[PDB]
Design a protein around this ligand. Structure first.
Ligand SMILES: [Mg+2]
Ligand SMILES: [Mg+2]
Ligand SMILES: [Mg+2]
Ligand SMILES: [Mg+2]
Ligand SMILES: [Mg+2]
Ligand SMILES: [Mg+2]
Ligand SMILES: [Mg+2]
Ligand SMILES: [Mg+2]
Ligand SMILES: [Mg+2]
Ligand SMILES: [Mg+2]
Ligand SMILES: [Mg+2]
Ligand SMILES: [Mg+2]
Ligand SMILES: [Mg+2]
Ligand SMILES: [Mg+2]
Ligand SMILES: [Mg+2]
Ligand SMILES: [Mg+2]
Ligand SMILES: [Mg+2]
Ligand SMILES: [Mg+2]
Ligand SMILES: [Mg+2]
Ligand SMILES: [Mg+2]
Ligand SMILES: [Mg+2]
Ligand SMILES: [Mg+2]
Ligand SMILES: [Mg+2]
Ligand SMILES: [Mg+2]
Ligand SMILES: [Mg+2]
Ligand SMILES: [Mg+2]
Ligand SMILES: [Mg+2]
Ligand SMILES: [Mg+2]
Ligand SMILES: [Mg+2]
Ligand SMILES: [Mg+2]
Ligand SMILES: [Mg+2]
Ligand SMILES: [Mg+2]
Ligand SMILES: [Mg+2]
Ligand SMILES: [Mg+2]
Ligand SMILES: [Mg+2]
Ligand SMILES: [Mg+2]
Lengths: 188, 167, 155, 131, 260
RNA sequence: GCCCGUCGCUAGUACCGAUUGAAUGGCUUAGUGAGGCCUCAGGAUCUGGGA
RNA sequence: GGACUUUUACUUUGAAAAAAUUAGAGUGUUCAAAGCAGGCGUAUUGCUCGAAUAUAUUAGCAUGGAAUAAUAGAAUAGGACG
RNA sequence: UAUCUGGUUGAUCCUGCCAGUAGUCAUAUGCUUGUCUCAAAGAUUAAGCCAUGCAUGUCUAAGUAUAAGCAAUUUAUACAGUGAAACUGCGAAUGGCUCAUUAAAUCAGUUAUCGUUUAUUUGAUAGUUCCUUUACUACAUGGUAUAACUGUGGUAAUUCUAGAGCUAAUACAUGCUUAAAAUCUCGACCCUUUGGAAGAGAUGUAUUUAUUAGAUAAAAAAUCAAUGUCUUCGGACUCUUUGAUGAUUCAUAAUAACUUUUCGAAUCGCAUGGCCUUGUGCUGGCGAUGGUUCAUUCAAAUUUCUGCCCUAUCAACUUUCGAUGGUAGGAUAGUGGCCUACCAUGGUUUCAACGGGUAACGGGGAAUAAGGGUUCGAUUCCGGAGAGGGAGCCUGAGAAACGGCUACCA
């Protein structure tokens, strides 16, 4: 099928290289997962030497990490908003690594308020203890508190769904969220 | 003589591409497909034979079929299969309820029964005993050499606090 | 090569797993990761000082140097972040018991930490295939220029 | 796919084919030791010239050089052994000298005659070849 | 070429085996195991070409299949089984125990060793790391994995091994002035001491060496195998104690030994 | 005495040359496109959403 | 371990190195081309020498040399040590 | 192992070729042909075509046996000896042959994997599996559905197979489990402190992600936000723990979670014994097959430096439809323009690029013997490529396999 050899491909001098031997199965390559949104559906693929690889095609939930918060939840993936490599990925809502997506927010809400006792946006015994043991550590951040209003947080895909069948990432923040923000709107 | 092949429709013949686990094909090598012809699943006058199977028996005995009745060759061989052909509860002991087949050797009439498999026997339990035992035996073993090494490092830090108490 | 902007890509540029928690107010903004590639090459402070990202930096990237250590005079600086040196050498023809001038043009990747101009002698280090052609990396600049600021105007 | 069976020739052949004087010298040699063809001479002088080569070669390397001592004595001792080389001239410029007849005088063909027992270098042959 | 090669052409066989050119056209390809191809000695070679104990190889099968032979303690039934350096071959009949060990010419010798020295082996930790669950381990040149070694123990040090039980009883660091046995090169089989070690960051550390004859030489550190103190070796060395005489020297000793 | 060329004979080689001459082999634009693999569907039937 | 090193060519020595082939030692295949054997006894219950050495280069590595032959440095001092 | 000789003239000395001469692990052919040993051999031309036969099959006490098979004997009324067939397992990816293509390709010497996959062998390695956690989940062992066979058939034809009826497992598919401990989160109550607490759950390994640890370039101080261990209640913190490399985000570990959840023995053989509260209770010897991770070994894939024959009547080559590089992704076992998207304008060249030729596989080597050279290597060892020409793919640890398949061409 596809061959990752370099023995086609003109020489750096520009010369044309002859055919030497036929395609080998080990220099092969397979097609793209082009994994998309919704209804979990994955196909294991027999790679070299035993070893499955897991091709995601349609994924709808994934594990996402509040980085500056040291937790993680799985949430629905709302969809794709930005992609540095190809725009058609955004338009087809294709999940790939480095994709920029939106996620369910609320499970990160449910945790926060139950951990800080503060509620985003806009009375037990030892509970009060903990909530008051924290804060001065609850300040969150202007543009990350914001997104909660919408019930949709911006997060970068970090996994390689074509490979692992997972669709995992981290909520955007700080300097990095600042980047995609500026990008997102001055094109919107 | 090309065989029909269920679920291909058509009252004609076509050339399919068959694999392991499928009608009209016995592969000859681990993961081999040969491309063979096939008659469709739609009855036509081009057939030599229909294979048919009674489903409801009408009003008149059909001589060589209803009138006569052949037995099943083999009887139950696994543990519970016996239990399930006779209905016994894991209690009634299979070893008598296995099925015995007579045979004569000129003037010696023989008797031969299966070999219940998956039968729970003392030998099995013994091996089950040894499994669990060795799993734990080494468990503790590993914990032993474990703390045996923690010492080596602990009275090495007393050898580095008597070395650092020398000079 | 780089210079300016730093964040001039469609992708956000950053070092992998070098987190900065915005919760924790800082005076340097971005924590940076660098290494000493070994073999006796000082990692120029302009790698530590700098802001460039470059995942192929032998000092601030995930490339590692090992194998051949070569030197050549820089002969072309026209490709972004990679140059092409010319290593020359005399070759022995034994029937004639004499030598002849040959050469090679090894293409090598160069980290923003160095600023190189054409003519400079360089010292490169082998690494994994980094591109179609480059299998080496600029690891020290030996020269400086060619006494250039002493080629100026009138008295 | 099996090992090589190795072989060699055992003789050289005269540059000029027809030196009337070399043929004289040769046929003399033959009928004097009862040999059948010129090859029996071609054989010897060949191995004779390789010896002289080795010698020549060695006699360039330093006196008391490692090789020409090890391989030096080896050559000398082997020659002296079979009784070609003379005991006195035991230091390998005689090996450089030497000559063909010296080798000739040691064939069992010839000894079988030299000490009685044959009276003719030819009776020598026949007897030997006749067990 | 599509897969593991399973044959050996006698000719491509390791030469220090001393197999004759003809009489066949294959040699035995050593099996997979504890030591590398190019540096082992299969049971078929030791039991037939050294020991002269079998004639056929078919016989070497019949011998081994009786569990007679046992390597490093365990039984070892494989005809081709790769036997390497420091291993312990023990014929249970005959009472005989051998430690595989090098000549000076550079081959394995038939070296009869004591019934009780045969109860332990020597081995060079080629590496040490940190394993699963934080357990550290060393791995010797025969692929022995030994968990929980000594903190002081690290690569290029040699180790004394019980064989009986798997574990290590002693070790010897790689110091200036320790006994050393060259396991490769044209100095393969030589023995002695260590002058000093040239470093060279990037690869190939040199090892300057002298023996009990004030003779020097150099090998790669990979080819070096610590084995004790000057004088005191931790194993019985074979005759000629790996000292290497000149060809002319050896020519004299063999033509001094002459009087019947 | 030697000796040069046209011209005439016999033989042989190579050239030029209407035939927009001919053959073989290697790449290749364009059009057409088998088959397997991947993929969206499909559900003969066959049991628990999957086969 | 820190802090730094103007560039080469040549040349010496050494590592790392397949065997067969070549050169070559040992050995009476009856000679020899070969082969890697074989040789000694208590030849009734074994003793024992062997299976060398060299070459192996252009490149790469390691190292001794500092002639020959290049290259770089302090002149708008934008020098050198502190 | 450093040699020449015949031929231009009437004669002469030179130039210079032709001729002679010698060898060829260098083919053929002619004539002749007795002995020993040794033994190459359809390479060259047509990698042109092939009748027929043979060249890959395989069983241990030890996965499966109701042959309606043999043997009967020797204890065996579940099984037991031997064993067709068939299932299961493993091998068929080695070997053997050929030199077609191939000129910076192969190949060689020399590097790299801090850039990967790896059956096997060898060494190491698993108390964690269930569930809102008293009227419980088969563990004294859970599920069917198939070959072989039985029988009914089809075709001129094949290593074609159909309909029916059976029945196995180390096939297929399921699914129980085991010490103490500690650490984490929750936290019913009580009581105001300086604050503590019943008890509730989570915690095998593997997978995916994010965050930490992984020190060391010689020594010290203050304060902010939390919050560790010991009171002699102003307070002190004193001993404090560190693996490898030239070098890492390494080896390894910790935190929050993720999974159509990887693995954690429903397997088989020889023996049959201890021990009492006599439950056929509880235990228990030797070793086979396995099983995850690591290591090792057999490998493999890429890979740095330098080195190829003739050719300028080949001087500019390279980016259509990647040519050189950057970012991101995808794809792979993995690096990488390998592919895609975006972006730039690069890369090579008189030190010969690019193109052409090769009656070109490369090497170890072979022939010729002053030396320097010249010529040769299809061909006993190594590497490589192919199996009529192309492409595609299944199986698998490993094939782009051809004594495997699918297609097109011939
Ligand atoms: Mg069973
Ligand atoms: Mg550019
Ligand atoms: Mg073998
Ligand atoms: Mg290294
Ligand atoms: Mg026409
Ligand atoms: Mg697709
Ligand atoms: Mg040298
Ligand atoms: Mg030799
Ligand atoms: Mg004449
Ligand atoms: Mg005349
Ligand atoms: Mg006249
Ligand atoms: Mg001539
Ligand atoms: Mg042919
Ligand atoms: Mg041939
Ligand atoms: Mg053919
Ligand atoms: Mg039976
Ligand atoms: Mg092969
Ligand atoms: Mg079923
Ligand atoms: Mg299974
Ligand atoms: Mg710290
Ligand atoms: Mg450390
Ligand atoms: Mg890691
Ligand atoms: Mg009992
Ligand atoms: Mg031309
Ligand atoms: Mg790129
Ligand atoms: Mg352009
Ligand atoms: Mg030219
Ligand atoms: Mg060719
Ligand atoms: Mg060849
Ligand atoms: Mg050639
Ligand atoms: Mg040919
Ligand atoms: Mg290679
Ligand atoms: Mg092939
Ligand atoms: Mg084609
Ligand atoms: Mg094929
Ligand atoms: Mg084949």
């Amino acid at each position: 099928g596809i061959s990752r050899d370099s023995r086609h491909k003109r020489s750096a001098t520009g010369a044309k290289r002859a055919q030497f031997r036929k395609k080998r199965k080990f220099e092969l390559g397979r097609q793209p997962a082009n994994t998309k949104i919704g209804a979990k559906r994955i196909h294991s693929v027999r790679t070299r030497g035993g070893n499955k690889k897991y091709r995601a095609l349609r994924i709808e939930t994934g594990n996402f990490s509040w980085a500056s918060e040291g937790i993680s939840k799985k949430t629905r993936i709302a969809g794709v908003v930005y992609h540095p490599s190809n725009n058609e990925l955004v338009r087809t809502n294709t999940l790939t690594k480095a994709a920029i997506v939106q996620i369910d927010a609320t499970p990160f809400r449910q945790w926060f308020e139950a951990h800080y006792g503060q509620t985003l946006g806009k009375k037990s015994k030892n509970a009060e203890r903990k909530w008051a043991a924290r804060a001065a550590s609850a300040k969150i951040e202007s543009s990350v508190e914001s997104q909660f209003s919408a019930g949709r947080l911006y997060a970068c895909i970090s996994s390689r769904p074509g490979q692992s069948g997972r669709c995992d990432g981290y909520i955007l923040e700080g300097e990095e969220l600042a980047f995609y923000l500026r990008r997102l709107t001055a094109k919107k | 003589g090309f065989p029909m092949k269920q679920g291909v429709l058509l009252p004609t013949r076509i050339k399919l591409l068959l694999t392991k686990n499928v009608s009209c094909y016995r592969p000859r090598r681990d993961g081999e497909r040969k491309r063979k012809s096939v008659r469709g699943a739609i009855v036509g006058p081009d057939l030599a034979v229909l294979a048919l199977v009674i489903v409801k028996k009408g009003e008149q005995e059909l001589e060589g079929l209803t009138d006569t009745t052949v037995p099943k060759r083999l009887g139950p061989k696994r543990a519970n299969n016996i239990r399930k052909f006779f209905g016994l509860s894991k209690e009634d002991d299979v070893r008598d309820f296995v099925i015995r087949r007579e045979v004569t050797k000129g003037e010696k009439t023989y008797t031969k029964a299966p070999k219940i498999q998956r039968l729970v026997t003392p030998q099995r339990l013994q091996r089950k005993r040894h499994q669990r035992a060795l799993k734990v035996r080494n468990a503790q073993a590993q914990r032993e050499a474990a703390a045996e090494y923690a010492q080596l490092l602990a009275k090495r830090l007393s050898e580095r606090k008597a070395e650092k108490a020398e000079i | 090569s780089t210079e300016l902007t730093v964040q001039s890509e469609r992708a956000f540029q950053k070092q992998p797993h070098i987190f900065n928690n915005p919760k924790v107010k800082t005076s340097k903004r971005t924590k940076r990761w660098y290494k000493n590639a070994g073999l006796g090459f000082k990692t120029p402070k302009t790698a530590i000082e700098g802001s460039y990202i470059d995942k192929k930096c032998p000092f601030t990237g995930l490339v590692s140097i090992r194998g051949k250590i070569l030197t050549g005079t820089v002969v072309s600086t026209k490709m972004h972040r990679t140059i092409v040196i010319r290593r020359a050498y005399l070759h022995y023809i034994p029937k004639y018991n004499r030598y002849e001038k040959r050469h090679k043009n090894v293409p090598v990747h160069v980290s923003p930490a160095f600023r190189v101009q054409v003519g400079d002698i360089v010292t490169v280090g082998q690494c994994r295939p980094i591109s179609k052609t480059v299998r080496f990396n600029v690891v020290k600049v030996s020269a400086a220029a060619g006494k250039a600021n002493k080629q100026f105007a009138k008295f | 796919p099996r090992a090589p069976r190795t072989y060699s020739k055992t003789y050289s052949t005269p540059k000029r084919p027809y030196e009337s004087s070399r043929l004289d010298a040769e046929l003399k040699l033959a009928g004097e030791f009862g040999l059948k063809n010129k090859k029996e001479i071609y054989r010897i002088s060949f191995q004779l010239s390789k010896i002289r080569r080795a010698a020549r070669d060695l006699l360039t390397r330093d006196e008391k050089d490692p090789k020409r001592l090890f391989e030096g004595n080896a050559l000398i001792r082997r020659l002296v052994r079979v009784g070609v080389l003379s005991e006195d001239k035991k230091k390998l410029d005689y090996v450089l000298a030497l000559k063909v007849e010296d080798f000739l005088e040691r064939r069992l063909q010839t000894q079988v005659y030299k000490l009685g027992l044959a009276k003719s270098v030819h009776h020598a042959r026949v007897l030997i070849t006749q067990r | 070429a599509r897969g593991p090669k399973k044959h050996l052409k006698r000719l491509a066989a390791p030469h220090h085996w001393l197999l004759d050119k003809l009489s066949g056209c294959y040699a035995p390809r050593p099996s997979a195991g504890p030591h590398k191809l190019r540096e082992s000695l299969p049971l078929i070679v030791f039991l037939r070409n050294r020991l002269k104990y079998a004639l056929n190889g078919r016989e070497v099968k019949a011998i081994l299949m009786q569990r007679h032979v046992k390597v490093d303690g365990k039984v070892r039934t494989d005809t081709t089984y790769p036997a390497g350096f420091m291993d312990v071959i023990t014929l249970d009949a005959t009472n005989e125990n051998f430690r595989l060990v090098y000549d000076v010419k550079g081959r394995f010798a038939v070296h009869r060793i004591t019934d009780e020295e045969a109860s332990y082996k020597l081995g060079k930790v080629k590496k040490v790391q940190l394993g699963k669950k934080g357990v550290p381990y060393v791995v010797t040149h025969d692929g022995r994995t030994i968990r929980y070694p000594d903190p002081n123990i690290k690569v290029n040090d040699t180790v004394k091994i019980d064989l009986a039980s798997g574990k290590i009883t002693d070790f010897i660091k790689f110091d200036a002035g320790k006994l050393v046995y060259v396991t490769g090169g044209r100095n393969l089989g030589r023995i002695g001491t260590i002058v000093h070690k040239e470093r060279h960051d990037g690869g190939f550390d040199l090892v300057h060496i002298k023996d009990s004859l004030d003779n020097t030489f150099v090998t790669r550190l990979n080819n070096v195998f610590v084995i004790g103190e000057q004088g005191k070796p931790y194993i019985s060395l074979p005759k000629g104690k790996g000292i290497k005489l000149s060809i002319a020297e050896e020519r004299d000793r063999r033509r001094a030994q002459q009087g019947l």
